[PDB]
């Protein structure tokens, strides 16, 4: 009797996350008040098995 078992397992995984927050607020002496805040998130995952 002869047996040969061969198992191969491969797992790959990548996570990429980017965040940006840009604020700009100008405030005179109780005449003009201007505030602008922008946000940006980017979250990506990728897993590959075999």
């Amino acid at each position: 009797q002869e047996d040969h078992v061969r198992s191969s397992f491969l797992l790959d995984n990548q996570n990429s996350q980017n965040t940006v927050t840009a604020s700009a607020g100008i405030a005179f002496l109780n005449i003009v008040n201007f505030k602008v805040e922008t946000d940006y998130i980017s979250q990506t995952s990728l897993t590959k098995d075999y």
């Binding site: 990548q14 990429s16 980017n18 980017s42 990506t44 990728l46």
Partner: protein
């Protein structure tokens, strides 16, 4: 000898992953699937003795 030429259509979803880099610093791999209706014309012939 031209036997027959006919066109065949089939819908297939191709999955592809691409690395998009915006501003050369925001690099992310995005995987997208595109459903395309591939169409191909097959022309079958046959060889007779000249």
């Amino acid at each position: 000898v031209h036997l027959l030429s006919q066109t065949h259509e089939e819908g297939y979803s191709r999955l592809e992953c691409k690395k998009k880099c915006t501003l050369k610093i925001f690099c992310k791999t995005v995987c997208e699937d595109v459903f395309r209706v591939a169409k191909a014309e097959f022309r079958a012939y046959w060889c007779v003795a000249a």
